[PDB]
């Protein structure tokens, strides 16, 4: 809070944004952007019914 009385908020010194945590990975499906998962299976598993 400044002596003039004006309030300094975070939005006045920074840009807040719902972004990502790890920014170093770009996944694209058939050129289109996308995000996927890799199912590494389990030790004792049924490769078909799973």
């Amino acid at each position: 809070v400044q002596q003039d009385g004006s309030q300094v908020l975070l939005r006045d010194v920074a840009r807040v944004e719902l972004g990502a945590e790890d920014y170093s990975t770009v996944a694209r499906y058939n050129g289109k952007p996308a995000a996927g998962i890799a199912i590494k299976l389990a030790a004792g598993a049924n490769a078909l019914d799973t």
């Binding site: 030790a43 004792g44 598993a45 049924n46 490769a47 078909l48």
Partner: protein, 50 residues
């Protein structure tokens, strides 16, 4: 041995038991491309941002 020859019903019952056990086995048995072959590994991952 040779005492099954005199008792065909015993042999047939043993065959039926084998077939039943085999069917029960194939109904519930895991299927996979390959079993666990590689020696077990443990991976420790740590992250230091920047």
């Amino acid at each position: 041995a040779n005492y099954f020859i005199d008792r065909p019903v015993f042999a047939w019952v043993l065959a039926i038991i084998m077939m039943l056990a085999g069917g029960l086995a194939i109904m519930n048995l895991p299927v996979a491309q390959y079993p666990q072959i590689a020696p077990p590994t443990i991976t420790v991952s740590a992250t230091y941002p920047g």
